[PDB]
Amino acid sequence: SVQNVVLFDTQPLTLMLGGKLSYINVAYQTYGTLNDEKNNAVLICHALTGDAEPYFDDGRDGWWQNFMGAGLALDTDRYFFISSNVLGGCKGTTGPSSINPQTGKPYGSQFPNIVVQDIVKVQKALLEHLGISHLKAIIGGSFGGMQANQWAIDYPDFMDNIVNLCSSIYFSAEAIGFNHVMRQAVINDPNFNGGDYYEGTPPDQGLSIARMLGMLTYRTDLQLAKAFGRATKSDGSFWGDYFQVESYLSYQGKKFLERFDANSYLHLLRALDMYDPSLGYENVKEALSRIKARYTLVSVTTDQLFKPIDLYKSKQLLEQSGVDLHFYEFPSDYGHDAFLVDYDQFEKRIRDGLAGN
Amino acid sequence: SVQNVVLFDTQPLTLMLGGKLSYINVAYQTYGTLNDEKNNAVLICHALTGDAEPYFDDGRDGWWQNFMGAGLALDTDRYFFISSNVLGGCKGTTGPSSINPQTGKPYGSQFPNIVVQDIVKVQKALLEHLGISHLKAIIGGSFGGMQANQWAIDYPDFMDNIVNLCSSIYFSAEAIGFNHVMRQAVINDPNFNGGDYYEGTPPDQGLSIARMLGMLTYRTDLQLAKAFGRATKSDGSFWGDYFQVESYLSYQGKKFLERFDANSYLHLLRALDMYDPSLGYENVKEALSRIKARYTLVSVTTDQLFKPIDLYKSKQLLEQSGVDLHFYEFPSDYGHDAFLVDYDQFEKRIRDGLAGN
């Protein structure tokens, strides 16, 4: 039961890469109870395909369901959580599928290019609307960790703690490569129509293929060996699903189409791979030297997307700027998805991160 | 200047998965001089996108150019090398782009499904034609290593030495996943026309995307970080090439179209991921227990496609069947491509492998 507010109505959002957006709807949810001191507020930043709803109490499973709730690491008895769909998203916050106020048709190909710096400005405006003037913590994994990192730079005294799970401050060359293949799969779909597909058939073939590729970067080869190995589908096909792992990828690629928009996927992939914490500052050292928060950074050693090399490059850059840094690492079969799955290994890191330990 | 011979004319090749092929042209090349004892013959088996020409002496660069020649690891002063394009290929040996003798049009969608067991039967027939009744060695990397492995099983006393570089006897679940995405990229190209595209526009979009994905599995993230890092293209585009790594992938994907056929790519991907040395035998242990050759297996520890987990699973299976096994491993920035690039680390392994050391 997502909440909504229209912002940037009387003054547009000026985007880092140029051009502007007006009448930005922000979809968001809150959980728990803000205390009298108002000192227990936590911002949750979602990952690439996440949305405003990490948790439900009524029987549904949110994207962080088993990590969140009464007495759990994301403790709804303790904190007041705010979670919002990013600018450029497709689950309520203004994105390329939204109606362009200037045309009455979806933005589509006309949606401006956005970066994490824009996304966090929208989140700041939301918190201003909600009357939250300081945060106990900001927490996010993956693309959400980049949002948390950017918050730490842009609003250095606004939060006590930053909890960055499984992200680096720069995306690797190889990871850019995967994003590139995913974008090209979408854009070369015969129904893409340059991004203006909303009045016709959507680019389902390309988006489902892109999603399958993304999924192959999110866990580990060991996890897939355990789940499927070389099990075969009973009546498979050579040019379709023959192995069980192929069946699973095809099923999940198709299921993804029910919940995501191709243009949003393109815009957020580019925000992710373009992310540069130095943008708007003299250089990265100057940007990171702004950070005053207690900063927790967690590396999964088996992550195949944000690999240890990237996490260590980030660790070094943060240390070089004198960040109050607390770095932790461990292996997980779940690789990049571990921050969403491996509660046993993340529980203490999250609990301690939020609390200032 | 490839040589050609038509085989399986008076008796068709019966394929493992059913159905038959007649009038199979085999494109091949020989190098060096067969000695009077005829005991210096070596079969080279090419990898997924390789062909019959690993070497040229006239100025051109073959696919194994810097490893091969006078006094080099693949020593053309010492051995008589035979190299042939695989069944299902597109560089001279009968494949889906070849004319179907029964229709006068390319096989296309009518090309039968093939496996490594079929490919090696064609190679055996070629050697019979050439009057080679025993080999000093068989050598191949990647998909070529699978061909070498299969030779060792099917014709156990036909060769002294087997040199298997960077392949396992089974493809992993994750690796199957990548093949699946690559196949779907091709098949969902608007010009694929179910595989019968030869009279129209070829599926260039899908094939170039598939190739880009393949390339991201063939080296290492470190190698890409060294080559490109986050360097940008001077006048890039958001939905096209923005980073230098993207430019490179797009350029190489396009260049690949000049030399490869989409249907061949599909057929060989399936031969690779379906490869099962137990096929036609009671089980894998029975199959591998047939091997009598001195068997060299090399693992690149940084290989991101045939990962150490797979190479060790293979090592164990070969040992369990009492194979005369000689296993070596080392890291390389070039990962799966190291057997084609990293001469410094492969030179001794190849030299020793061929010679019976």
Strand, coil or helix: what is A84? strand
Task: Please tell me if residue B107 touches chain A, with a CB cutoff of 8 Å.
Answer: no
**What residue numbers bound the domain in which A257 lies?**
172-275
Q: Note if A221 is an active site residue.
A: no
Give which of B240, B180, B213 is closest to A178, Cα–Cα: B213
Nearest CB to B239 within list A183, A222, A250: A183
Q: Which residues pair with A31 in a beta bridge?
A: A81
Note whether B115 and B189 are same-domain residues: no
Give the end of a domain, one of B223, B246, B275: B275
How does DSSP classify residue A112? P
Q: Give SS3 for A246.
A: helix
| A115 interfacial to chain B (CB closer than 8 Å) | no
Q: Is B187's CB within 8 Å of A239's CB?
A: yes
In a shared domain, residues A258 and A324 = no
- Rounded Cα distance, B357 and B350, in Å: 10
Q: Are residues B13 and B124 in the same domain?
A: yes
> Residue A297: helix, strand or coil by DSSP?
strand
Please tell me the distance from the alpha carbon of residue B280 to that of residue B143, in angstroms, as a whole number: 20
User: Is A153 within 8 Å of A277 (Cβ atoms)?
Assistant: yes
Task: Indicate whether B31 and B138 sit together in one domain.
Answer: yes
**Rounded to an integer, what distance in angstroms lies between the CA atom of residue A167 and that of residue A151?**
14
Rounded to whole angstroms, the Cα distance separating B126 from B123 reads 5
From the list B176, B181, B187, the residue facing A243 with the nearest CB is B176
A99: left (phi > 0), else alpha (psi -120 to 50), else beta?
A: beta
Domain identity same for A285 and A306: yes
**CA dist list (Å): B2 to A221, B52, B84, B91:** 40, 7, 9, 10
β-strand partners of A41: A80
- Other Cβ atoms within 10 Å of A29 Cβ, number: 21
* Candidate list B142, B247, B289, B332, residue with the active-site label: B142
Structure tokens at A73: 């690491």
Q: Are residues A33 and A144 in the same domain?
A: yes
Judged by CB atoms closer than 8 Å, whether chains meet at A309 and B222 is answered as yes
Q: CA A287 to CA A273: how far, in whole Å?
A: 18
Q: Do A174 and B205 touch (CB under 8 A)?
A: no
B249 at A interface, C-beta within 8 A:
yes
Distance from the Cα of residue A276 to its chain's centroid: 15
Q: Is B337 annotated as belonging to a binding site?
A: yes
Q: State which of A275, A292, A310 marks the end of a domain.
A: A275
Do A221 and B187 make contact, defined as CB atoms within 8 angstroms? no
Give chain A's domain count: 2
Breakpoints of chain B, after residues (C–N > 2.5 Å): none
> Is A204 annotated for ligand binding?
no
The verdict on a CB contact (< 8 Å) between B188 and A180 is no
Q: Catalytic annotation on B261?
A: no
Instruction: Tell whether A190 and A103 lie within a shared domain.
Output: no
Residues B115 and B217 in one domain: no
Which two tokens mark A143?
């693309």
For B276, the token pair is 């099962």
Backbone region of residue A166 per phi and psi (left: phi > 0; alpha: psi in -120 to 50; beta: other values): left
The number of angstroms, rounded, from the C-alpha of A15 to the middle of its chain's C-alpha atoms is 19
For residue A136, give how far its alpha carbon lies from the nearest alpha carbon of chain B (Å): 34
Q: Which of A98, A120, A106 is nearest to A43 (CA)?
A: A120
**Beta-carbon neighbour count of residue A121 at 10 Å?**
21
Rg of the Cα atoms in chain A: 20
CA–CA dist A335, A307 (Å, integer): 9
Of A309, A162, A178, nearest to B302 by C-alpha is A309
Q: Which two tokens stand for residue A209?
A: 């293929």
Distance CA A322, CA A113 (A): 32
Mutation to test the A interface, candidates B196, B207, B213, most A Cβ within 10 Å? B213
Q: Looking at chain A, which runs of residues are DSSP E strands? A: 3-7, 13-14, 20-21, 24-31, 41-45, 68-69, 74-75, 80-84, 135-141, 159-165, 294-300, 324-330
Q: Are A228 and A243 in contact (CB under 8 A)?
A: yes
Pairwise CA distance, residues A103 & A85, whole Å: 24
Q: Which residues fall within 8 angstroms of residue B47, CB to CB, at 6 or more apart?
A: B140, B141, B142, B143, B144, B340
Do B152 and B206 sit in the same domain of this protein? no
In whole angstroms, what is the distance from residue B256 CA to residue A158 CA? 52
Q: SS in 3 state form for chain B?
A: CCEEEEECCCCCEECCCCCEECCEEEEEEEECCCCCCCCCEEEEECCCCCCCCCCCCCCCCCCCHHHEECCCCEECCCCEEEEECCCCCCCCCCCCCCECCCCCCECHHHCCCCCHHHHHHHHHHHHHHCCCCCEEEEEEECHHHHHHHHHHHHCCCCEEEEEEECCCCCCCHHHHHHHHHHHHHHHCCCCCHHHCCCCCCCCHHHHHHHHHHHHHHHCCHHHHHHHCCCCECCCCCCCCCCEHHHHHHHHHHHHHCCCCCHHHHHHHHHHHHHCCCCCCCCCHHHHHCCCCCEEEEEEECCCCCCCHHHHHHHHHHHHHCCCEEEEEEECCCCHHHHHHHCHHHHHHHHHHHHHCC
Q: Chain-centre distance of CA B164, in angstroms?
A: 11
Residues B149 and B52 in one domain: yes
**What's the CATH number where A225 sits?**
1.10.1740.110
Which member of B51, B160, B167, B336 is catalytic? B336
- B9 as an active site residue: the answer is no
Residue A257 forms contact with B (CB below 8 Å) = no
Q: Identify whether residues B191 and B220 lie together within a single domain.
A: yes
Q: Is there a contact between B276 and B317 (Cβ–Cβ < 8 Å)?
A: no
Residue A109 forms contact with B (CB below 8 Å)? no
Mark whether B178 and B204 lie in a shared domain: yes
First to last CA, chain A: 33
Torsion of CA A184, A186, A190, A192, to 10 degrees: -120
CATH of the domain at A51: 3.40.50.1820
Alpha-carbon gap, residue B305 to B166, rounded angstroms: 9
Q: B230 vs A176: CB contact, 8 Å cut-off?
A: yes
CA distance A319 to B137: 55
Q: Is B178 on the interface with A (CB under 8 A)?
A: yes
Instruction: Look up residue A126 and give its DSSP letter.
Output: H
Task: Judge contact between B99 and B89, C-beta under 8 A.
Answer: no
The 10 Å Cβ neighbour count of residue A255 is 12
Residue written as token pair 């918190």 = A127
Cβ-based neighbours of B14, under 8 Å, separated by 6 or more: B20
CA nearest to B183 within chain A? A239
CA gyration radius, chain B: 20
Domain's final residue, options A275, A306, A337? A275
Q: How far apart are CA B265 and CA B203, in angstroms?
A: 12
Question: CB B229 to CB A270 under 8 A?
Answer: no
- Cα distance between residue B176 and residue B171, in whole Å: 7
